[PDB]
Amino acid sequence: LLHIRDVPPADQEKLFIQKLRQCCVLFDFVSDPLSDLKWKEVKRAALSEMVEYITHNRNVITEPIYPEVVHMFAVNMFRTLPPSSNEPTLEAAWPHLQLVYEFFLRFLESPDFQPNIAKKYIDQKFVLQLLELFDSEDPRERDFLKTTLHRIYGKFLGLRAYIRKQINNIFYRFIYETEHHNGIAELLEILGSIINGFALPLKEEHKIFLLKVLLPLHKVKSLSVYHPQLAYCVVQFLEKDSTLTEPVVMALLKYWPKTHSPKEVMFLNELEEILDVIEPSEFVKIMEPLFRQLAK
Amino acid sequence: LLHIRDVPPADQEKLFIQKLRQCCVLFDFVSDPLSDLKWKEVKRAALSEMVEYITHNRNVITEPIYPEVVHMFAVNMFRTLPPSSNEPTLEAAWPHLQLVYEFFLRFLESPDFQPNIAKKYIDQKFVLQLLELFDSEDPRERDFLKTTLHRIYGKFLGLRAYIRKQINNIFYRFIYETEHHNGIAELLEILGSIINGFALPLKEEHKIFLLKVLLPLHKVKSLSVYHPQLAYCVVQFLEKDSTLTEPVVMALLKYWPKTHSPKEVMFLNELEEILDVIEPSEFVKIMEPLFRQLAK
Amino acid sequence: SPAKLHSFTHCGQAALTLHGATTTEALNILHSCHACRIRRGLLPNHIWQGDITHFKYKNTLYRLHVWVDTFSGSVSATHKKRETSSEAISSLLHAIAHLGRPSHINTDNGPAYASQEFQHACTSLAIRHTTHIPVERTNGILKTLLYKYFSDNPNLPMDNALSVALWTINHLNVLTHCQKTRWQLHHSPRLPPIPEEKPVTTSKTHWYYFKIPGLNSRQWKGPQRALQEAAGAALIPVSDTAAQWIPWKLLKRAVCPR
Amino acid sequence: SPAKLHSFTHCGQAALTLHGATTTEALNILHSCHACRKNNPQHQMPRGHIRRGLLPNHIWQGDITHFKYKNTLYRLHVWVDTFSGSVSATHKKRETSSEAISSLLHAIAHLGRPSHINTDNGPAYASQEFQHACTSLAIRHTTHIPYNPTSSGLVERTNGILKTLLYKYFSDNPNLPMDNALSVALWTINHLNVLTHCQKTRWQLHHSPRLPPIPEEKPVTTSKTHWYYFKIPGLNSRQWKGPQRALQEAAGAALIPVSDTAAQWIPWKLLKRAVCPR
Amino acid sequence: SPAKLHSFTHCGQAALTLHGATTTEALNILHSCHACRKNNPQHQMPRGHIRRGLLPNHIWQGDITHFKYKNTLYRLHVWVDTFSGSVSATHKKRETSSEAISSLLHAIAHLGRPSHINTDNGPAYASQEFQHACTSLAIRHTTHIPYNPTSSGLVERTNGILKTLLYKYFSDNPNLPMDNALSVALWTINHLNVLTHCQKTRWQLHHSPRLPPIPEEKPVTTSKTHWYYFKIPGLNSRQWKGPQRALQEAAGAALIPVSDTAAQWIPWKLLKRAVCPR
Amino acid sequence: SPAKLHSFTHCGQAALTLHGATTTEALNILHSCHACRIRRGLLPNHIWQGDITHFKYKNTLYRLHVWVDTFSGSVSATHKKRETSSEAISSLLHAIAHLGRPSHINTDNGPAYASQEFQHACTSLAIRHTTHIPVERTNGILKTLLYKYFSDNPNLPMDNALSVALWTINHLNVLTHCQKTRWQLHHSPRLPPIPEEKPVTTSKTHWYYFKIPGLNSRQWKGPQRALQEAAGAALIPVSDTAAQWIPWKLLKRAVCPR
DNA sequence: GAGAGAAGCGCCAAACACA
DNA sequence: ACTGTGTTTGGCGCTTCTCTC
DNA sequence: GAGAGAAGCGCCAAACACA
DNA sequence: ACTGTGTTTGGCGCTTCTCTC
Ligand SMILES: Cc1nnc(C(=O)NC(C)(C)c2nc(C(=O)NCc3ccc(F)cc3)c(O)c(=O)n2C)o1
Ligand SMILES: Cc1nnc(C(=O)NC(C)(C)c2nc(C(=O)NCc3ccc(F)cc3)c(O)c(=O)n2C)o1
Ligand SMILES: [Mg+2]
Ligand SMILES: [Mg+2]
Ligand SMILES: [Mg+2]
Ligand SMILES: [Mg+2]
Ligand SMILES: [Zn+2]
Ligand SMILES: [Zn+2]
Ligand SMILES: [Zn+2]
Ligand SMILES: [Zn+2]
């Protein structure tokens, strides 16, 4: 077509919409390495040009642009997952994937973005389709999904409890129904970001969260991959109130494997951090049983 | 009393008026050299302080100050002239005379002075009493009177023709009735200042002035003292119009003394300046009789 | 050119693929190169590991003071001809100058790291020091990289090789699991806390009057917003078509017109 | 005649006005006078600004600074990133091409690989060795106009800041080792001190998300040239030289033919506007 | 601890704030630090202005200037009236007390008798001969602070103006005699050129009606004194010295005890505000 | 002290009376001193008279080039060891530098003042030169003053005496008739022309913002009027009680508040 | 005929140098 | 008492004047 | 009880030095 | 391509807080 910056501003938005719809066409990289090379090249050029345009202009975001941008995202990402294969493989469509990720990320951070216009275009179905993508084995996708979900949660106010319930459900399914999951490290980082912003006094729902889906997360065989983040989260919770730490250590001493294993040392590491916080305020109520369990 | 600058501004004008009336007392310097020394000293200090005050403050001139200031001037200057004595002598009261002159001169030049307020306090009688002082043999008085009359003529508009008629009358009396006059050099300087500000075309009254009281002024025995100024005046008149110069040279050739005398050379000098202006515009109408008279 | 990049740095395949090289080309470069043929910490700059390594030369010996972060694997190494407490302090200071101030540090018991001088140094910066008596993988990676560099050119001043090795394992090589570089993992800003019951508003950039460089103008041409800010300039849209980086000296802080 | 009066006395505009002239005629008399314009040290020309990178690790500035300590002269090689202001400094015993290369590689390990670097034409920067080292790393190196230290303003200012911190530290411990002080100062400058105008540290700018792409550039310059009085940067002169016509003028300097054979680049601070002889 | 952090690193205010401190506490930490204030070259102190006469021929400023012409070095003795700016200049072969007296008498004949004159402490101005000559004429002579040429700003600026005119004249006639050029330049400066701000010539101000009397003066000065960091005008120093208490401070300078035995006058441009040790 | 003034200058009695001396004291000083016991031009700087005088010394001779105004008697003299056309030009230039540019000059016929060089000098300044073949009173006054000064001190460098003599007869002595000094008569501004049918309004001084010296202030404290203007300062009333001379650098031209 | 270019004129902040 | 200052210069706002639809 | 001092805090132009 | 710049500092306007008639 034509460059967006070389047209009069009267119809510039129309050309922007046309290029937005020009990225709705899909391209298969896994079917065969060589197919429609020039189409993919012009798609890459169009994505780069649009993202370079969006972050250097103001008052370009208007209502007739709000919905279908999300549509383009939904056209490119909301899809069936590749078959599981258990170094991890990288998606063959990663070039266009990275361009669309970076475009959406900069779009969501535009100072002209209004949070009261996406309430009719981004809803719980979009949230589910975005969260289900966290199962991807591609670490780049998970990192981008983390940095996208964080901003979506921060900007919006009416979709927070829904995400919290959804992540509780996915924790339940991961810990009980199916063990196959790999997007667990970044989810805990997002949780820690949310936990750090708590106030006083703490809500009892957060107590249910920790006592139901956070502490039991230790009994998973695959904790080694995501041991630190989880630990960080509890340190981000008990610092608000030192009174509610006794159930934490009580459950922690019970999840301890009574047999010798390499996995023991990580548990000790966690205790150290808890110790570095639990010594003040005269917390010796559970010191004796903790020492008795540690001796064995 | 007290210093004018060391009192509140509410009654500062009252103290200024009191000091103004404090200079209304006269002191005789010619009666005896030593009399009331401290009174004269405090009068000098008061005059110096008042004139230093008036030229460093603004918005101090107000209606209740306008009249009696002139009164003080009238108290100090409008007086009988000292007897004539034909180096010239200096007035013994010159200290206070110089202080009051400089005070009045700075007062008349104050930026807050309004020319529409003196129209009811300075009138033709003040003009006559000021002009009659020009007969004084003291050159300082004549110089100060010149610089005072010039500003009075310049500021006021309704008293110009009166001064012109008065100076015509004094010229008539000096040239015909009484030869005793010595304030003639400065009067011509003031006249030249007035003449230079003429416009076009010239008024016939000025022609009467030159043809009646200005040219005949040459036949006075005492022209030597005031030869240049008079000459300057005619050069300041004929430059406006070169057509009206023929009567000037015609009368000039007639006032020439037919006998040999030291006074002849001055006449020649005047001719030179006229020559330096009369050569252009093809002025040879009276060249032949002028050469014939010059040859003899 | 990825071939020259490998021939100078001998980095990994992901480094070449991040550049213009392709997977099969990167593999070809790998097999054509004759020489190449858990996280106990919770946060970056939280726990460090300090080791001393001996580098063997044909007629001399080198001491490498190495500090490694236990969350990103970031490496800070200094080379010395001897070893003492003051040199341990110097290496720690250099590591802080490159990475930042750690919260806790961990090391072996020895003549260094246990003397009063090192304790005084740690206490002045408020760093808690713990000692133990018995990572070694980072040491091995560094040793292999230095050996490869010296094999490529035996006439190296033993300083450029260390600098290049640190550049390679910090900025060029990619961690296998997270598929990130050590530098990017170490210095990536973290997710800000999300306050409860309070919307996360977007930060608003200030407004400026500006003047066009190179014109000797004297009248400020209206207030505008800044797209970006940096050290020495700000991105100001001069017109509705293009934007320019205007220096601070030609900028004047303003108030929003409202 | 105002022309003759000025030709004799070279009086000013107000002097020429009173002898009879309009302001425009006296102003043109002053402008057309060569003697007045060659001898007046005043001039009004625009200001130049160093080239700044579009993103981190695009353009760097480097310089060498001397420091006196314990009867020893240390040479500090300093590199500054023109986008973020991040500083890398190394202390050496002498200035040499090998030391320049070592300091550059240390800076690369500390900060990253830069696209372009520019430095003043020092003896150790114009060597074949340094150019070969830069070319092997695909680093394009340019130099400044000679005898113009202001063309490297950012790095010189950073030299001043670094030395001030070093003096502050040595004021307390005269026995403090040099490398300890340099490391502490570098940590303070990059990680602790806050930039005055953007209210962020140098390290925060250097590792900020690179999501904003590079804005586009334009190589179009002015197609016209003028006549200029000039002074040579190397040697100061009381009076101007010329005037001469500019071969081409960029944003911040111009080509002036100094002699009949060689032309030269002169910054706008040493140029004065002239009038066309024809 | 912000105090310990600053004592180790000497970081700035914004650095101390983020480690936990209010702006006032960090600001006081910076103010109370001796190392920061001895080593920062910045300071904020008022500006001084030379003493100006109340009326013509009250205070004069004099100086000697060198001029190069026909392989000969001429010494121009210049006197400027601090009220009207009128200039008297004489060219001599050498600087001597006799030449100083001759130039002063020439200036008196040209302009008039001055009440006071002040000049920098040159070798030919502090002589007994010059003081005797001034005393015989009832001329009170004062001197400036040593190594501070800015204390005679008006005469130095007039030196620049005079030399610029001389160069303009010699640009046309290299064979023009020196005295001809000096006379023409003096006529141009005093009688032709117009002052920039009052829009009148120097001669017009000098012979203006003296009717306005002298305004009154006040010798009352500030009765309080403070502590000051300082630099000695003669020798430049990188870092400040002190602090020390001022014996008394006038409008434009102060007495600082430099050593334990001798005090000295230092202008406000070489002083820095300190804090009271008690 | 008038006694010292006479003993150094030997001026007239009116000079002493203008100072602290009284008439009888001045007469006493006169008779106690052993050594002391028409206008053809129309305007100042209109016609000058140029003369050359020979000063006799015990073993040498001096040439005095003297120019006298024919309206005020103002004297400009230069001393030379020889005489030629270029020296006449130099003396005329010095006289112009002290008095101003004359309109016409008058002198005798001789080797100087008649050569082509002098004519060229006069034409460049637009001065009309007239020559005649035959004031001498000014020469006599100068000769007597120089003789008195040399009698007071035989060890004079023949330059200070001339400068003092010019100062005495220009600034100190008083003309008998007009009772003014030569300098004051020469440089007195003349009466401005009085336009007809138009009032002579008073010139209004401009208004300024100002700052108090020595305070390091940064806010201009309101606009005010100027009592007087000079080179380098303006008289500004800081309050309704006192006024101060504020320098131009601390002044900013303003507009009348209306 | 009439409002838009064009010339005219006055003011000014930043730079400069006085060994 | 001690103490920086006066002139040059392209750009701007503002006023007066002339050639064109 | 309540408006005037007082502390707090953020912004800024001029000066300074980098061989 | 060629090209000056970043930090310190007493004073000010403005906001928040406390002791007094
Ligand atoms: C060709 C050729 N060979 N020698 C020169 C030359 O003239 N350079 C001198 C001054 C020694 C020089 N100076 C600086 C410097 O920084 N000056 C201090 C400063 C900085 C900023 C500011 F605004 C004013 C002064 C350097 O870095 C530098 O390398 N050199 C060589 O040119
Ligand atoms: C004691 C003692 N012995 N020697 C000095 C001394 O330091 N003086 C130097 C500079 C030679 C000096 N300088 C100037 C001068 O005018 N400087 C030029 C300038 C003028 C203004 C401005 F802002 C900057 C510079 C003189 O007049 C002068 O007589 N001298 C002796 O002090
Ligand atoms: Mg350099
Ligand atoms: Mg440098
Ligand atoms: Mg001097
Ligand atoms: Mg000087
Ligand atoms: Zn390899
Ligand atoms: Zn000229
Ligand atoms: Zn400090
Ligand atoms: Zn005598």
Author numbering:
A (entry chain F), B (entry chain C): 27 to 112, 124 to 333
C (entry chain D), F (entry chain A): 3 to 39, 52 to 148, 157 to 280
D (entry chain E), E (entry chain B): 3 to 280
The authors write:
The binding of RAL to the intasome is largely mediated by strong interactions between the three co-planar oxygen atoms of the drug and the Mg2+ cations. Parallel π-π stacking of RAL’s fluorobenzyl ring against the penultimate 3’-cytosine in STLV vDNA and interactions between the oxadiazole and Y149 strengthen the binding. As observed in previously reported intasome:INSTI structures, INSTI binding is accompanied by a flip of the terminal vDNA 3’-adenosine, which vacates a pocket formed between a dC:dG basepair and a 310 helix (IN residues 151–155 in STLV and HTLV-1 INs). The pocket becomes occupied by the fluorobenzyl group of the drug, whereas the displaced adenosine base forms parallel π-π stacking interaction with the heterocyclic backbone of the drug.
Integration of a DNA copy of the viral genome is an essential step in the replication of all retroviruses. The STLV-1 intasome:INSTI structures showed, as we previously reported, a twofold symmetric IN dimer of dimers with the two B56γ molecules that laterally flank the intasome.
